[PDB]
Scaffold this active site. Sequence first.
Site, mmCIF file in Angstrom:
data_model
loop_
_atom_site.group_PDB
_atom_site.id
_atom_site.type_symbol
_atom_site.label_atom_id
_atom_site.label_comp_id
_atom_site.label_asym_id
_atom_site.label_seq_id
_atom_site.Cartn_x
_atom_site.Cartn_y
_atom_site.Cartn_z
ATOM 1 N N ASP A 1 26.244 19.997 -16.606
ATOM 2 C CA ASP A 1 25.151 19.524 -15.748
ATOM 3 C C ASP A 1 24.518 18.254 -16.370
ATOM 4 O O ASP A 1 24.588 18.025 -17.578
ATOM 5 C CB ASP A 1 24.127 20.656 -15.740
ATOM 6 C CG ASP A 1 22.963 20.403 -14.841
ATOM 7 O OD1 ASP A 1 23.164 19.766 -13.771
ATOM 8 O OD2 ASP A 1 21.849 20.858 -15.221
ATOM 9 N N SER B 1 27.490 17.151 -11.347
ATOM 10 C CA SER B 1 26.114 16.821 -11.060
ATOM 11 C C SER B 1 25.798 16.732 -9.577
ATOM 12 O O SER B 1 26.607 16.274 -8.771
ATOM 13 C CB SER B 1 25.774 15.486 -11.702
ATOM 14 O OG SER B 1 24.469 15.057 -11.307
#
Lengths: 227, 227
Positions: free
Chosen positions: A9, A121
């Site tokens: 992430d 992401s």
Amino acid sequence: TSIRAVVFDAYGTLFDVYSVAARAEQLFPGKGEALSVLWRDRQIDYTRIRSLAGPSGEHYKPFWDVTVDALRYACARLNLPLGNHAEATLMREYACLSAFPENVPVLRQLREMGLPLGILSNGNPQMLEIAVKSAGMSGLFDHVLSVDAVRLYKTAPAAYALAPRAFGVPAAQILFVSSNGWDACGATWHGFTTFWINRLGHPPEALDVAPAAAGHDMRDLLQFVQA
Amino acid sequence: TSIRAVVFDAYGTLFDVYSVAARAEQLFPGKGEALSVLWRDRQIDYTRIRSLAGPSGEHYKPFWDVTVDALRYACARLNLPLGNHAEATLMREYACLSAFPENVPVLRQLREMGLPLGILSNGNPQMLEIAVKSAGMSGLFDHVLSVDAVRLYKTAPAAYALAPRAFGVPAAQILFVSSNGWDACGATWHGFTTFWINRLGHPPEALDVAPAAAGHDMRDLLQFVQA
Ligand SMILES: [Cl-]
Ligand SMILES: [Cl-]
Ligand SMILES: [Cl-]
Ligand SMILES: [Cl-]
Ligand SMILES: [Cl-]
Ligand SMILES: [Cl-]
Ligand SMILES: [K+]
Ligand SMILES: [K+]
Ligand SMILES: [K+]
Ligand SMILES: [K+]
Ligand SMILES: [Mg+2]
Ligand SMILES: [Mg+2]
Ligand SMILES: [Mg+2]
Ligand code: NA
Ligand code: NA
């Protein structure tokens, strides 16, 4: 099962979002921590509302534009004077963030132990790419992936599915790393080995699922792999 | 286009959730407004995380049990002593809520102007049914609908779709009423005529869509239909 790749992430994990809250304070004295909280809430709320409403991307909009929307709602709600300059300024701030100082070496102790590295992401790629260049991590990632390819935000399966595809390995063999408890949990449902960087020391989400392990920072993540 | 039916959201719309915040304060002095806020946040976050993660219901759990999960997370996070009694007490409180005093007559000025009435709620039906009996609105609704039939929470299309099905009319001919801005907006995307009871006077959600009209209370809704 054996990790053969490690995916991160972006925000709060690789990149410290801190510097936005601090710059909010300066444009809006006494209202920085409130704006920044409300803004993150609505940013995420809006990605979910949209993807839930159009499970095939019917209401998709790139994360950048969603971030403007959320910032705008938050300012209207909080009665803050956000015109073009203060908006441009906060968005600039958003484009270009810095890493948690611990990250860049830890990435190396993993690259060096024979591990391909990626980013997955909510970030649209245009914002994800420069964002990466602010921080000196160019070269460390084989794949820099955006949910923009599928027009659906996490926790949507199509978003998680991007990483097995790019890496040519099953979910079970990718270590999925996030700061957001909801995301560690969503990734575990998809079938990744997951690690949760629980930076603020919060409880686990009550989702009837738990990541493989959790820690306080990136260096705890290194600990865990090496084991 | 001509309204031929009117469907309501439950909580904050028909039913004042206020009495839960007040009872939180009593079990947890100084921490009621904080708990109640965090609890509502996570309750909704959890319905979205789940439905987004399993677009065919793979991670569904009824709203009741999701509400327990959220309450539990919120207490752990906020360091509050929630064991069986205080949990049971707050959930009881949740089961049985009271109406906004203005509602029950306004429902009549609509029933009397020849309008079938329904509820469409994230609420599992077991909790939705008694909830209704607390408030004296038994008989006013032709259909009392729960997203439990489809195992997916709003803003999922399958949840919105329940109301056209039950009423035998297209979305365009149902007036959809909610207190939650996100839900007025999601309903407008599905194709309902929507009215937003904006009780706290908040800005419109920055979702690139707006309900047909909005007001402050149920009696504003009556105003609007009659027009
Ligand atoms: Cl933020
Ligand atoms: Cl929301
Ligand atoms: Cl799909
Ligand atoms: Cl609540
Ligand atoms: Cl969340
Ligand atoms: Cl489906
Ligand atoms: K499709
Ligand atoms: K800058
Ligand atoms: K299916
Ligand atoms: K009671
Ligand atoms: Mg939220
Ligand atoms: Mg305002
Ligand atoms: Mg605690
Ligand atoms: Na996959
Ligand atoms: Na429909």
